Design a protein around this motif. Structure first.
Motif, PDB file in Angstrom:
ATOM      1  N   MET A   1      66.618 -25.098  58.643  1.00 30.27           N
ATOM      2  CA  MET A   1      66.219 -26.317  59.620  1.00 30.27           C
ATOM      3  C   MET A   1      67.450 -27.089  60.118  1.00 30.27           C
ATOM      4  N   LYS A   2      67.623 -27.335  61.452  1.00 26.80           N
ATOM      5  CA  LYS A   2      68.835 -27.925  62.079  1.00 26.80           C
ATOM      6  C   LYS A   2      68.718 -29.461  62.090  1.00 26.80           C
ATOM      7  N   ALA A  23      71.467 -35.896  56.960  1.00 25.42           N
ATOM      8  CA  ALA A  23      71.541 -34.908  55.882  1.00 25.42           C
ATOM      9  C   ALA A  23      70.165 -34.443  55.378  1.00 25.42           C
ATOM     10  N   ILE A  24      69.183 -35.358  55.452  1.00 26.20           N
ATOM     11  CA  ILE A  24      67.833 -35.139  54.993  1.00 26.20           C
ATOM     12  C   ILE A  24      67.202 -33.882  55.606  1.00 26.20           C
ATOM     13  N   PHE A  25      67.572 -33.477  56.837  1.00 22.95           N
ATOM     14  CA  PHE A  25      67.213 -32.221  57.493  1.00 22.95           C
ATOM     15  C   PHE A  25      67.435 -30.977  56.605  1.00 22.95           C
ATOM     16  N   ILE A 102      58.984 -35.629  51.853  1.00 17.68           N
ATOM     17  CA  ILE A 102      59.806 -35.785  53.055  1.00 17.68           C
ATOM     18  C   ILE A 102      58.853 -35.794  54.267  1.00 17.68           C
ATOM     19  N   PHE A 103      58.827 -36.948  54.952  1.00 16.82           N
ATOM     20  CA  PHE A 103      58.234 -37.183  56.257  1.00 16.82           C
ATOM     21  C   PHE A 103      59.317 -37.704  57.191  1.00 16.82           C
ATOM     22  N   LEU A 104      59.451 -36.998  58.298  1.00 19.34           N
ATOM     23  CA  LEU A 104      60.399 -37.199  59.382  1.00 19.34           C
ATOM     24  C   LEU A 104      59.597 -37.401  60.657  1.00 19.34           C
TER      25      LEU A 104
END
Length: 286
Positions: A1-2, A23-25, A102-104
């Protein structure tokens, strides 16, 4: 994942982070469930439809979406506010595994349908690949990276995916539909594809309009018997297809393709305007 968010800020679990800290990506697994929505004039477009897929996908897979409806709206509204931006595409990613959630939520780049493309329709190509967990909009599921190189060195606006069995499924980000030599409407069936939001709208419209869409397995070889195609999808609306690899179509000149296009635009406008009307009645007797 980018590290794929644009503008200045995204959301990572109820904290607003800056896009200089992405960074969380890296921590995001391929099993993450996502959604894309258009924001238009601050309205997340067909919110109810997307959240229903999001929630129901989670539920069926056996996770949870960490956030309730009211919170997701709040996240989108902060991205709009913090980014000083009320149009574009928003992505929501969700992943949970026993504490480690993790929610983005963040803007990604928008497509712009050029002049050529608006009158002629779009160039598309064939890509050999099938999506893991295709019923589900997952990270694993997305062809985007796979088809980057190809698409560019092609001028192709979508790469239409092809199986083992040499059936055309869906676009990397779109459902595809076909008008028969016959003038019947064809789309690949439910269980080989992502149940697109806009797919669904197109189906309903076709049906208001009285052409039934025949859910049907479509081969590479069947390209001779096809007079038109369109692609459907959050990022591409309903887009006429001029060409598929080498097979020219004159999709923008079928009166019915045009009809569906417009019918869809109407739906978007009426969604947005319903909302903005409500908000405003609400500003008025404040």
């Amino acid at each position: 994942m980018k590290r794929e968010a644009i503008h200045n800020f995204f959301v990572a679990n109820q904290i607003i982070k800056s896009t200089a800290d992405m960074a969380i990506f890296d921590k995001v697994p391929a099993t993450a469930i996502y959604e894309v929505m258009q924001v238009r004039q601050g309205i997340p477009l067909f919110f109810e439809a997307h959240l229903e897929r999001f929630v129901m996908s989670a539920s069926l897979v056996g996770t949870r979406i960490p956030k309730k409806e009211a919170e997701i709206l709040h996240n989108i509204a902060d991205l709009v506010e913090k980014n000083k931006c009320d149009h574009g595409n928003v992505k929501l990613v969700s992943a949970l595994m026993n504490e480690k959630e993790i929610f983005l939520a963040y803007f990604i780049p928008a497509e712009f349908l050029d002049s050529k493309a608006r009158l002629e329709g779009v160039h598309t190509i064939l890509f050999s690949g099938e999506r893991i967990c295709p019923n589900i909009k997952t990270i694993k599921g997305s062809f985007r990276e796979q088809v980057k190189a190809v698409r560019e060195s092609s001028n192709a606006y979508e790469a239409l995916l092809v199986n083992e069995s040499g059936h055309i499924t869906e676009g990397s980000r779109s459902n595809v539909f076909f008008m028969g030599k016959d003038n019947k409407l064809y789309t690949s069936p439910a269980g080989s594809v992502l149940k697109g939001v806009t797919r669904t709208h197109v189906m309903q419209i076709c049906s208001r309009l009285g052409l039934e869409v025949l859910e049907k397995t479509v081969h590479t070889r069947n390209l001779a018997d096809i007079q038109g195609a369109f692609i459907t999808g959050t990022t591409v609306d309903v887009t006429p297809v001029r060409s598929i690899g080498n097979t020219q179509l004159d999709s923008p000149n079928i009166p019915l393709i045009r009809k569906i296009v417009a019918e869809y635009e109407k739906k978007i406008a009426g969604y947005v305007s319903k909302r903005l009307k409500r908000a405003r009645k609400v500003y008025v007797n404040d």
